[PDB]
RNA sequence: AGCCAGGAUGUUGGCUUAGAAGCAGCCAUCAUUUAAAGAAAGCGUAAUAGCUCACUGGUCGAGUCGGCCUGCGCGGAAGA
């Protein structure tokens, strides 16, 4: 579970997510798992996806995780009436805009990558799609 | 395998062999085996040597498309699991009778030996010739 | 014991940046005090030693071979390393020192264990029984 | 070798832009040198295929328009966020 | 036999088959591979 | 003239088929005759140089008249002989160790010529060089 | 796509293992006869053997195969 190392605050407004990805292009490896969906990846989801990905590809092949949570999610303690101040910071999430590159891979064959990313997508909530580094 | 390139090139090999070949022989393993082949083709290798090369491809649209130019008498060999074999290394060879004897001797058969024509011999061992 | 070029008995101290065993033979560096500094034959650190003073160095062998360090490497953890415990018993030489290094930069699970050997042969089978376990992606003498 | 047919655009702007991009054809532009920057509409499919070749982003392209076989070097392209399709291209006139 | 919402070929012999609309996976090899639904 | 029954090709000692794997139930599951096999094999291979695991093919007859078919001791063994190596490598072509001489192998490829595939000793010599690949050996002229 | 045959030899390759011979592990990933046969893709034996495959030839003889982009549906889908 990746977690922000001490933020400026402790709680953040719910906000929204009316947008598109910025890191749309694959940055490092010649492989990436672009997220087609529009969601909120929990640290758990990300770390788990990494595990499965990694497991599949053995220790060979470098991997990057383009996303990072940095969005504290508060929630009320089960069974408490609305109000009485904002809830406790249950966990952390990372907002995902359609077309957001998630994980990137390199040093391994396209086929294996395709499979690892398949498993990653499986673990992940939002729908994704396989991609390859673009030549400019 | 690729295409017309190798096909036509193997055909060049064909012309090569017929260019100075004598009584080319027909070849068609019915139920022979590779273990036998180890000393089989090796034996052709003991005959003339690099001579026998059973490039199976008696396809009427393939090797047969490559046939015409030399010893067109070869066509007759078109349908079913058959092939070709010449006699470039052998003007007036005894190479043909070798196939008869073996036709009934450990090889099941090889198109039952009939060949084509240079010393005027279809299904006929080239008997009347100095060894 | 160690036939330092035609004579044994000579006080020496084994190097601690390498693990010499009765194999490649050993280069012998003469320290100020503590007599001889066996550093195994052929080693980078050994290289700098020669670099500054070749004259005070002569070879050595084994005459008539114990204690060594090994770096086994495992997959993260969640328990199968406990599997390694089970192996602790099967290992003949008493483990001398546990030293896991799971740190580095990733989820790597290396362990610098220190033990001993009675004969190079026996060592062979050592690596064998280490290579068998799937979680033991790596197992080699640390230097 | 990357020869490409293309039409002159006559409706620059986001509206027609998307209106066109929906029509399996997308806007892109040729510019560079003292020559006047030129809005260029062009078929999506063909180029979608051409780009697969890395040379498409190195080899001098030969866009054709009204008989004008202008040669241009590939400069930049705005791919869609996720849908495997082009949205816009930047042909440095060469 | 399995009754998954996600049937898939399990071996070389596994074969997808749409009986009366219900999708199925009959398999000449291991009977266990037989599964329905999806 | 029998062809199929107990005809399998098995490496066996040129004149010492006594252990279990070389003889024992290795031909026992196939049911082969230790007895006469010894008598004749020994009786004739005593003239043959001993100690090298030459390949042999058991050929059974209808009333059990066996024909062991020895070829020529293993190229790997010939490599141990002429090269003077006692062992190849745990890492074939990753750590070549046994020193070799081309002509030695060529003449040894002539013995193997005596029994191989084709006609040219040299092509068979390449097979022996291929054997050297199989075990990880340094080549030397 | 079916149907015929063959699918090896050197040599059971080496380290290794009682045995690793195609098939415990690791390396090698060559040669040969080749139409084709990988020191082997699945199965199989204590290892073998053996079953099969890739591959190649025969016949038939017209397209067939694998992905992508989208329209519309199917399954997923049980409550008093």
CATH number, domain with residue B26: 3.30.70.1730
d(CA C131, CA C121): 16
Q: Is A45 helix (H, G, I), strand (E, B) or coil?
A: helix
Report the CATH fold assignment for F72-140: Arc Repressor Mutant, subunit A (1.10.10)
Name the strand (E) or helix (H) holding B47.
helix B34-47
> Which residues from D are below 8 Å from A25, CB to CB?
79
User: On the CB side of A11, how many CA atoms lie within 13 Å of its CA?
Assistant: 11
d(CA B44, CA B27): 12
Closest CA relative to residue C135, chosen from C70, C80, C88, C98: C80
Kindly report the number of other CB atoms within 10 A of residue A121's CB atom: 23
Kindly report the number of other CB atoms within 10 A of residue B17's CB atom: 20
Residue A49 lies in a domain: yes
**Which of B38, B53, B106, B108 is the mutation pick for testing F, counting most F CBs within 10 A?**
B38
Q: Residue A78 is encoded by which pair of tokens? A: 């089960």
Which residue is the nearest neighbor of G69, CA to C1'? D84
Within A37-109, strands assigned E span 39-42, 62-65, 71-75, 88-96, 100-106
What DSSP designation does D73 have? E
Breaks in chain C listed by the residue before each, with C–N > 2.5 Å: 64
Q: What is the dihedral of CA A27, A32, A38, A42, to 10 degrees?
A: -90
Indicate the angle between helix axes F121-135 and F102-114, nearest 10 degrees.
110
d(CA B55, CA B4): 15
Domain with CATH 1.10.10.250 in chain F: 72-140
Q: Residue F99 is encoded by which pair of tokens? A: 């020193």
d(CA D25, CA D17): 10
Domain with CATH 3.30.1550.10 in chain F: 7-71
Residue A85 lies in a domain: yes
Q: Which residue has the tokens 């010939």?
A: F78
Query: First CA to last CA across chain F, in angstroms?
Result: 46
Q: Residue F52 is encoded by which pair of tokens? A: 């090298």
Using a 10 angstrom Cβ sphere, with 0-12 exposed, 13-18 middle and 19 or more buried, the burial of residue B80 is exposed
Structural domain F7-71, CATH architecture? 2-Layer Sandwich (3.30)
Q: How do beta strands F55-59 and C36-38 pair?
A: unpaired
Q: How do beta strands A88-96 and A39-42 pair?
A: antiparallel
Kindly report the number of other CB atoms within 10 A of residue D34's CB atom: 5
Q: Residue E37 is encoded by which pair of tokens? A: 């639904």
Indicate the angle between helix axes F121-135 and F75-82, nearest 10 degrees.
80
Which residue is the nearest neighbor of G6, CA to C1'? B33
∠ CA F80-F81-F87, rounded to 5°: 20
Torsion sign, CA atoms B41, B45, B47, B50: positive
Residue A10 lies in a domain: no
Residue A13 lies in a domain: no
Q: Is D46 helix (H, G, I), strand (E, B) or coil?
A: helix
Give the resolution value in Å: 3.9
d(CA B34, CA B17): 25
**Which of A39, A129, A133, A136 is the mutation pick for testing D, counting most D CBs within 10 A?**
A136
User: Is residue B33 within 8 angstroms of chain F, CB to CB?
Assistant: no
Q: What CATH code would you report for D1-94?
A: 2.40.240.10
Q: Where on strand G do bases come within 7 A of a protein Cβ? A: 4-16, 18-19, 21, 25-37, 39, 45-50, 55-61, 68-70, 74-77
- Across the beta sheet with D86-93, what order do the strands follow? D7-8, D38-43, D25-31, D86-93, D72-79
Residue A116 lies in a domain: yes
Closest CA relative to residue F124, chosen from F75, F91, F79: F75
∠ CA C66-C67-C69, rounded to 5°: 135
Q: Is B7 helix (H, G, I), strand (E, B) or coil?
A: helix
Q: How far, in Å, is the CA of B111 from the C1' of nucleotide G7?
A: 22
Q: What is the CATH number of the domain that holds A99?
A: 3.90.1170.10
Residue ranges making up the domain that contains B124: 1-130
Nearest to D82 among A34, A135, A136 (CB): A34
d(CA C18, CA A37): 54
H-state helical runs in chain A: 43-57, 110-123
> Which residues from C are below 8 Å from A59, CB to CB?
108, 137
Chain D closest-CA separation from residue A73 CA (Å): 27
H-state helical runs in chain D: 14-21, 44-50
* Approach to solving: cryo-EM
**How many residues are given for chain A?**
136
Indicate the angle between helix axes A43-57 and A110-123, nearest 10 degrees.
150
d(CA B54, CA B99): 14
Residue B83: what are its φ and ψ, rounded to 5°?
A: -165, -155
Which residues, listed in sequence order, are joined to residue C138 by a DSSP beta bridge? C73
Closest CA relative to residue A97, chosen from A14, A49, A31, A36: A36
Using a 10 angstrom Cβ sphere, with 0-12 exposed, 13-18 middle and 19 or more buried, the burial of residue A84 is exposed
Q: How far, in Å, is the CA of F134 from the C1' of nucleotide G38?
A: 15
Per the structure, the count of domains in chain B is 1
d(CA B35, CA B55): 19
Q: How do beta strands B83-85 and A100-106 pair?
A: unpaired
**Which of C78, C105, C107, C110 is the mutation pick for testing A, counting most A CBs within 10 A?**
C107
Residue C72: what are its φ and ψ, rounded to 5°?
A: -90, 150
The answer to whether the beta carbon of residue F114 comes closer than 7 angstroms to any atom of strand G is no
Assess contact for B18 and B70: CB atoms under 8 A.
yes
User: Is residue A6 within 8 angstroms of chain C, CB to CB?
Assistant: no
**Long-range own/partner contacts, residues F131-134 (CB < 8 A, 24 or more apart):** F131/F75, F131/F76, F131/F79, F132/F79, F132/F100, F132/F105, F133/F92, F133/F93, F134/F76, F134/F92
CA-nearest residue of chain B to F119?
B45
Name the strand (E) or helix (H) holding F129.
helix F121-135
Inter-chain CB proximity B49 and F119 less than 8 Å: yes
Assess contact for D61 and D72: CB atoms under 8 A.
yes
Chain A closest-CA separation from residue D67 CA (Å): 29
Assess contact for C69 and C141: CB atoms under 8 A.
yes
Kindly report the number of other CB atoms within 10 A of residue A101's CB atom: 23
d(CA A31, CA A106): 6
Residue E27: what are its φ and ψ, rounded to 5°?
A: -150, 120
CB-based touch A/D (3+ pairs, under 8 A):
yes
How many whole angstroms from its chain centre is CA A121?
11
Per the structure, the count of domains in chain A is 1
Nearest to A99 among D54, D77, D81 (CB): D81
Chain A closest-CA separation from residue C96 CA (Å): 29
| CA dist A99 → A52, A68, A96, A127, F43 (Å) | 22, 16, 8, 10, 82
Nearest to F117 among B38, B49, B50 (CB): B38
Nearest to D54 among A35, A129, A135 (CB): A135
Assess contact for F103 and F66: CB atoms under 8 A.
no
Closest CA relative to residue B122, chosen from B99, B90, B88: B99
> Which residues, in sequence order, are CB contacts of A73 under 8 Å at separation 6+?
A40, A89, A90, A91, A92, A93
Which residues, listed in sequence order, are joined to residue D41 by a DSSP beta bridge? D7, D27
H-state helical runs in C1-143: 44-52, 80-90, 120-131
């Amino acid at each position: 579970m990746l977690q922000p190392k001490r933020t400026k605050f402790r709680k953040m407004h719910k906000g929204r997510n009316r947008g598109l990805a910025q890191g749309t292009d694959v940055s490092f490896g010649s492989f990436g798992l672009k997220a087609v969906g529009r969601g909120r990846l929990t640290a758990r989801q990300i770390e788990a996806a990494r595990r499965a990905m990694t497991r599949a590809v053995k220790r060979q092949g470098k991997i990057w995780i383009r996303v990072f949570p940095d969005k504290p999610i508060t929630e009320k303690p089960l069974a408490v009436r609305m109000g009485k101040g904002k809830g406790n910071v249950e966990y952390w999430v990372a907002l995902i805009q359609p077309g957001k590159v998630l994980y990137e891979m390199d040093g391994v064959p396209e086929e294996l990558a395709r499979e690892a990313f398949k498993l990653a997508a499986a673990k992940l909530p939002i729908k994704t799609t396989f991609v390859t580094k673009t030549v400019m | 395998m690729a295409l017309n390139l190798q096909d036509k090139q193997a055909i060049v090999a064909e012309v090569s062999e017929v260019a100075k070949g004598a009584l080319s022989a027909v070849v068609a393993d019915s139920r022979g085996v590779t273990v036998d082949k180890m000393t089989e083709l090796r034996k052709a290798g003991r005959e003339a040597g690099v001579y026998m090369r059973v490039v199976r491809n008696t396809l009427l649209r393939r090797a047969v498309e490559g046939t015409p130019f030399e010893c067109l008498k070869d066509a007759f060999v078109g349908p079913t699991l058959i092939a070709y074999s010449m006699e470039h290394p052998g003007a007036a060879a005894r190479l043909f009778k070798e196939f008869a004897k073996a036709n009934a001797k450990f090889e099941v058969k090889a198109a039952a030996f009939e060949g084509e024509l240079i010393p005027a011999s279809q299904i006929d061992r080239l008997a009347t010739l100095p060894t | 014991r160690v036939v330092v070029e035609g004579v044994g008995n000579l006080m020496h101290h084994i190097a601690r940046c390498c693990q010499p065993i009765p194999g490649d033979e050993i280069v012998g560096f003469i320290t100020q005090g503590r007599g001889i500094s066996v550093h195994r034959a052929d080693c980078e650190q050994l290289a700098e030693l020669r670099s500054h003073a070749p004259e005070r160095i002569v070879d050595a062998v084994w005459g008539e071979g114990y204690s060594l360090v090994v770096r086994v490497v495992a997959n993260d953890r969640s328990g199968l390393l406990r599997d390694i415990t089970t192996i602790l018993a099967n290992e003949k030489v008493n483990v001398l020192g546990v030293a896991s290094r799971s740190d580095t930069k990733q989820q790597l699970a290396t362990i610098d264990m220190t033990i001993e050997i009675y004969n190079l042969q026996v060592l062979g089978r050592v690596l064998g029984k280490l290579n068998q376990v799937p979680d033991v992606i790596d197992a080699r003498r640390l230097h | 070798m990357f020869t490409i047919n293309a039409e002159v655009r006559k409706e620059q702007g986001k509206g027609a832009s998307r209106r066109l991009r929906a029509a399996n054809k997308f806007p892109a532009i040729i510019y560079g040198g003292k020559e006047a920057p030129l809005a260029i509409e062009l078929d999506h499919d063909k180029v979608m295929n051409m780009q697969a070749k890395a040379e498409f982003y190195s080899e001098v392209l030969t866009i054709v328009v009204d008989g004008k076989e202008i040669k241009v070097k590939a400069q930049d392209v705005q791919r869609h966020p996720y849908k495997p399709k082009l949205q816009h291209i930047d042909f440095v006139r060469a | 036999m399995k009754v998954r919402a996600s049937v898939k070929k399990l071996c070389r012999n596994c074969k997808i088959v749409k009986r009366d609309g219900v999708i199925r996976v009959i398999c000449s090899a291991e009977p266990k591979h037989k599964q329905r639904q999806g | 003239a029998k062809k199929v029954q107990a005809y399998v090709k098995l490496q066996v000692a040129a004149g010492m088929a006594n252990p279990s794997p070389p003889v024992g139930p290795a031909l026992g599951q196939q049911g082969v005759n230790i007895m006469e096999f010894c008598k004749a094999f020994n009786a004739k291979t005593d003239s043959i140089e001993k100690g090298l695991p030459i390949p042999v093919v058991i050929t059974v007859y209808a009333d059990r008249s066996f024909t062991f078919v020895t070829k020529t001791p293993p190229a790997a063994v010939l490599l141990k002989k002429a090269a003077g190596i006692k062992s190849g490598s745990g890492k074939p072509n990753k750590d070549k160790v046994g020193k070799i001489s081309r002509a030695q192998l060529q003449e040894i490829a002539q013995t193997k010529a005596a029994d191989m595939t084709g006609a040219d000793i040299e092509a068979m010599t390449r097979s022996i060089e291929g054997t050297a690949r199989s075990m990880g050996l340094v080549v030397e002229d």
